[PDB]
Amino acid sequence: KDNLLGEANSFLEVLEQVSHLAPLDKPVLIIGERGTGKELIASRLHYLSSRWQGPFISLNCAALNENLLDSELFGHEAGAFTGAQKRHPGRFERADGGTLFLDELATAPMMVQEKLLRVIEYGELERVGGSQPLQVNVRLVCATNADLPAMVNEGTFRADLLDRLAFDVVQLPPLRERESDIMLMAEYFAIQMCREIKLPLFPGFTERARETLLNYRWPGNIRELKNVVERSVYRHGTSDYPLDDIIIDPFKRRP
Amino acid sequence: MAEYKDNLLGEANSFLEVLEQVSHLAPLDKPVLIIGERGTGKELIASRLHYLSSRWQGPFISLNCAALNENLLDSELFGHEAGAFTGAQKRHPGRFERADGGTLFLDELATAPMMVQEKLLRVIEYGELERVGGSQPLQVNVRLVCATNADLPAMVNEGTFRADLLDRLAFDVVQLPPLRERESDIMLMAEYFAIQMCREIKLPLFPGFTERARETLLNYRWPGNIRELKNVVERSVYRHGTSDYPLDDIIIDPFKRRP
Amino acid sequence: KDNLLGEANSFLEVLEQVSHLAPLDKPVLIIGERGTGKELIASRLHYLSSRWQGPFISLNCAALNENLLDSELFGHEAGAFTGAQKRHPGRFERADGGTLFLDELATAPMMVQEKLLRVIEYGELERVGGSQPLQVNVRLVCATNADLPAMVNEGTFRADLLDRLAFDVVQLPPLRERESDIMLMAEYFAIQMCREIKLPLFPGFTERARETLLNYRWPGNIRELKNVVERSVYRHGTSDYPLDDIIIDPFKRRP
Amino acid sequence: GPEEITADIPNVGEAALSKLDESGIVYIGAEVTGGDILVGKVTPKGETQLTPEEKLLRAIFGEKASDVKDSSLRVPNGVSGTVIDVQVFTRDGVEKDKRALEIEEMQLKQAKKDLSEELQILEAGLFSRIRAVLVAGGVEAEKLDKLPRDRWLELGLTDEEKQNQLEQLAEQYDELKHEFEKKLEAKRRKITQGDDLA
Amino acid sequence: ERDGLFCARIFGPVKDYECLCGKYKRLKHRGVICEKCGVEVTQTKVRRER
Amino acid sequence: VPLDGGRFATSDLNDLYRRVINRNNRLKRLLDLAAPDIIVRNEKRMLQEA
Amino acid sequence: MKQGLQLRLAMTPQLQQAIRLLQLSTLELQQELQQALESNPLLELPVYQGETTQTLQDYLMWQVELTPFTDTDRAIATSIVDAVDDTGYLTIQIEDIVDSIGDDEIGLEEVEAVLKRIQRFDPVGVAAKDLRDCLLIQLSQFAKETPWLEEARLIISDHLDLLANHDFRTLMRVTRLKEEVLKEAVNLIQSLDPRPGQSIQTSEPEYVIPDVLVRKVSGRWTVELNADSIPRLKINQQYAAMGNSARNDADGQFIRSNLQEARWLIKSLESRNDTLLRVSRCIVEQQQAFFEQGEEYMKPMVLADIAQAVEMHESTISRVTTQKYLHSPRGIFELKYFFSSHVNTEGGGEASSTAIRALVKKLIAAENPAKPLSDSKLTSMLSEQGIMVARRTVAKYRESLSIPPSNQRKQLV
DNA sequence: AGACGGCTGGCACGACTTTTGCAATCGCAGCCCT
DNA sequence: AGGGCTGATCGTGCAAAAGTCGTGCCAGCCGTCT
């Protein structure tokens, strides 16, 4: 409950959908532009979820090691291997009732897709040589920049992985897609960043550069705008600098 | 005795006859092979069989070839008694050793390890199991059950499936109907899913399935037999609706991004 | 010695050659059709070998794991590593004079080929950091469905892997091949299926369907015929069903 | 173990049990001379080991085992005379009703005879109303006297006013029968509500 | 109670001539003092008189 | 004087002089440990009172 | 990383002793704490009421004193009476009393004469002494005019062994008399002053201090630790405040060492209490079937896995698990009593040797008193339960139950 | 009237419990020896 | 003026050998009916 969402028509509809689906512990899908921070809305929903007082631990799918994927999704029972002690619940078993936002879900491999399909079922967690699997119910959350239907058509993701998704795939509109309250939200973010960096304000201010960059691609739908604003503020290094000669082009070399 | 299936997610056209034939083969403990859509009509069939499974107290231990990693798979498969293979400790009850006399519930994971398939060929050869570093092999008994999703002959001709794996297996074939083919209990299953959603979500009443919704579902390819319909119904219920419109503008397909 | 062998000219010659080489403990290859029951015939000949009263332990060639190649082909001396106690002889060392029946050798890896070449040496059981190797003599037998010459031409089979077997390769005829005791084996299989299905007998009996299926490839030379016979017996659902409208086609969608 | 009144007093004279009813308590109205025992409660007593001496005692006499301390009610000294009646109250969760069922039965008999009499009057009023509605219209009182027959079941003394009156009175009689049954049920529940001790 | 209120080996004799521990459990035993506990195995008048 | 039998309900016979004696034994142990003179004096304040 | 892994302290003396005291019992730990506090310098209506033979002992002596007897005769009677067990028979015979006295004046003859004079005084058959002659004394005191009195006397004299098996037919054959001819005599012998006072003689009171009390609060029985029976370790804060100001380093160091030892001991006791509570909760969860249904529904319940999964291991918990009791609706149950045998499995099996004994008792009860039922029937019941007892593997269970069957003891109908 | 038979109790061994018996090395530095 | 070395303070586990049950299983016997 802290993201600098524009609260525009699309933003308000997305927030309403997230709040409505917050009580539901069923798995949900997040579509749209990554790098923009749809995960922040996921954390907000998880806080607003029914398991609000539950240990929510998200995970990056690409983070798990291939040969340690089993140790990632579970815990070594220590009845095997050279490793001792262990008997430590897996990240999902560590949460066991909270929200596990699947990060880098599109980065999941075919083996990872199959492991997720195995996890599409409820609980049944058996450790290394476990006597009996353990069932633990936890709410599920996933995000993916790439198109899950596109991956399935490519066959990169397993079919059950798509079938693992149950709730609506919330798609994030790009920077140009909404562009209704992005000016206000970016201004608020810039004000907060200036306060944090002991910068009072920008006396020059102005939005002619902002109005022009409204007709800009901004591939990083939300993060890129803030990064470019910070770069412009730092490079200008002055407050009484209006939105003139300020464009989103930090990599660009001056002439 | 008679154990009712938890769900009866089947097709009126011929899945009733399929269940009848399954009950006919229910008494036998030989290799029972099911087939159908993966993720949809498959493990629902497995649960129905477990309800129709012979006797009781049988460990319906289910294993998926995706798990158990790669190197650790063999130890959990054959078990482990000697040290340095299971860290010494107790003689590790392997995944196969976990279910003695129970159903060996298979999932159509298609383990790319031909070594896994070769291990499984010896798994059902004479009913025996030897632990890792085990000085003595042990003859074990258990039931077998599986569900399928791909043409085992097509893979075998392609070499993807070992000829010996299908030779030892595939005693009898039980293919679940594809969703685009049955088209019979579609209304029945849709009504059951809608009622279940209304009950769980505490909805005052089922909004109802409009003719446009039924027509779209019939036109829908629905690659998944028993789950894709379930997921679509869940998405439509999530989209929600007033009491006024029974199913007007219902979002069954959540993959469609909004404007 | 429980297999209902066809005793065909092929089957009888196979049994006779098996008995002739039953006293000899040299490596040999049981060639022909796998899935058809080479393991049962292997057990019968082991009971029929020179050391009939011996501990015979067979296993799948590719059953074990790659990292545990030493732990499977030998015993953990436990001097090094996290392994404790152990000092347990391998399954081959568990036989200690028995028949190491090679099964599923077609799936063996290059490391497995190297281990087999090491096994071509006379005994020489050296553990990890063991004092000295132990030479242990046991009977050897091999069975596979693929042409080891074909693999060696592909280079998959090592030269020593090809030379691992010390006798001429004895081939098992296919169902489309032997086709001799097809009526007798069919009748025995039908009797067994009826007994298992609690059916006293099939009043229809007859072999017109059996004769038609005789003019079929039946790739699973014994496996396919038995599975198909059991399937037809179950599908008929009535004893008074002659060998008509019965065929081997489990996969085909019935009209 | 609770002290249960079953006249199963260990080492009890036969005459002592000869007075107690099977309920541990005695019959009613019975006269007691001297310190007579009326209600024999069996307070549990402590147990012991194999005690082969006591094993032989059980093999010989048995049935005592020193397990039930006698909580029997014996008449007080200088107290002897007629027992007019008794009262037994059992806490909720205990309803042996060995003679409590009989007492509640007598009480409910009186209670129902009360409820019937009012119900009897109501039913008689309805029946006479039906007979009058059918009277003077070919349904002779002799027809109604021989069988209530719902006064020949709307014989047609008027067949419209008689018929409508019969329908209304039938509805009323059904309601009254339902009400009387409900009242009897409530009274039976109250009588069966039992006692509730500490 | 061991060395408690009205303890053995103290405050006079026991209820019976049998000792609390059990050693020297007889009314005939007069001078025999139980080794387990040194208390009077005699009449209990001394219990008040001790 | 156990009225209900379950509880002794010592009719003014439960001697805290037993607790005082326990405190005196603690004082004796501390004296064996040679406790501070303040503790000794306060030990008397309680033990000597008995 | 890969399917590979790796492997990863040492203490002794003081902590070892601290853990050792935790392995002890409740009252034993209370006594140990009381003794330890005796040395710790920094840690924090004459004769009640009763009746003649209130605990079954003085009525006989009062009756003897109510009769003329000499000082030696009174002493012999007192030796007989005071040495009478809770069963009413003379716990110590004349020889034991004479040996304890060591006096030749109180001889066997004098003690025997005193006992015979007090053989039936108040009540009949006092100081009975392995009561076989006391039954005969009761029969003789009973009027000889009773029917079959000669038959009863003959049975009581030396036919006790025959009637011990309750083989009335075999007893009659041995006595060369018709079966049930002395049935009135046998019944009278049964009703023959057993232990004289018997239950009145049995003044055996009840004492119990279970280490826990299972209230079974709304099922899933709520195990409440006996906090009253659980001592509270109090450290003398006065010594703490009187030691810090001590300029003498010796006194300050002694006080600091005492405080550290008290802290370690309190930690050990608190850990013992907490582990006992956790293990009791686990046992209650495992054997609610035993708690409610009874001994028949007994499955093994020794703490494992769950204790290890929670913290440390079952090691030293097996040590501290000793001597823990619980008062429940089923009764008083011990810690080792909570753990049972394994039948369905090697460990934690559904049935138990206690369940075997309970089923054996039920089956032997479910038979005619003449002949108890075959253990093969209870064996078949166990096989239905999955234990697969069989008649031979039941011998041990029957011996544990010690129920006398027909072959062990044949009673005549 | 000696053998069936279930008892029973001894006899046996693996599987689960247990309990007991295990803590150096400092690292200050100053004083004392060299 | 430089080396020695001085004892402080240093803590919740487990495991290793033993025991010990649980279950089963043999051996005889007495109640007995033959």
Residue numbers in the entry:
A (entry chain 5), C (entry chain 3): 5 to 259
B (entry chain 4): 1 to 259
D (entry chain C): 846 to 1043
E (entry chain D): 52 to 101
F (entry chain D): 253 to 302
G (entry chain M): 1 to 8, 11 to 46, 107 to 475
What does the literature reporting this entry say, word for word?
Bacteria use sigma (σ) factors to recruit RNA polymerase (RNAP) to promoter regions of genes that need to be transcribed, with 60% bacteria containing at least one specialized σ factor, σ54, responsible for transcribing many stress response genes. The σ54-mediated transcription initiation requires specific AAA+ proteins (ATPases Associated with diverse cellular Activities) known as bacterial enhancer-binding proteins (bEBPs). DNA looping enables bEBP hexamers to engage and actively remodel the RNAP-σ54-DNA closed complex to convert it into an open complex. In this work we capture intermediate states of bEBPs in facilitating DNA opening and partial unfolding of σ54, and therefore link the ATPase activity to DNA opening and σ54 remodeling, which eventually lead to transcription activation.
To understand the structural basis and how DNA is stabilized in these complexes, we determined the structures of PspF1-275-RNAP-σ54-DNA containing mismatches between −11 and −8 [RPi(−11/−8)] and between −10 and −1 [RPi(−10/−1)]. Interestingly, DNA with a partially opened bubble between −11 and −8 did not support transcription, suggesting that this complex is unable to proceed further to an open complex. In the RPi(−11/−8), we observe multiple structural conformations, at varying degrees of tilt of PspF1-275 hexamer ring relative to RNAP-σ54 and varying degrees of RNAP clamp opening We also observe significant degrees of promoter DNA bending, demonstrating the wide degree of conformational flexibility in the complex. The DNA density downstream of −10 was generally poorly resolved, indicating that this region was highly flexible. However, one conformation has sufficiently high resolution to allow us to resolve the DNA. In these complexes, we observe a previously unreported interaction between PspF and σ54 RpoN domain. This interaction is only possible with the tilted ring conformation, suggesting this interaction contributes to the stabilization of this ring conformation in both RPi(−11/−8) and RPi(−10/−1), giving rise to the higher-resolution reconstruction of these conformations. Significantly, we observe the σ54 N terminus is further shifted along the PspF hexamer in RPi(−11/−8) and RPi(−10/−1) compared to that of RPi(−12/−11). This would thus support the mechanistic model in which we proposed that ATP hydrolysis and the conformational changes within the hexamer lead to translocation of the σ54 N terminus; and RPi(−11/−8) and RPi(−10/−1) are further along the transcription initiation pathway. Second, PspF1-275 hexamer ring tilts, as observed in RPi(−11/−8) and RPi(−10/−1) structures, altering interactions between PspF1-275 and DNA, which could contribute to or stabilize DNA melting.
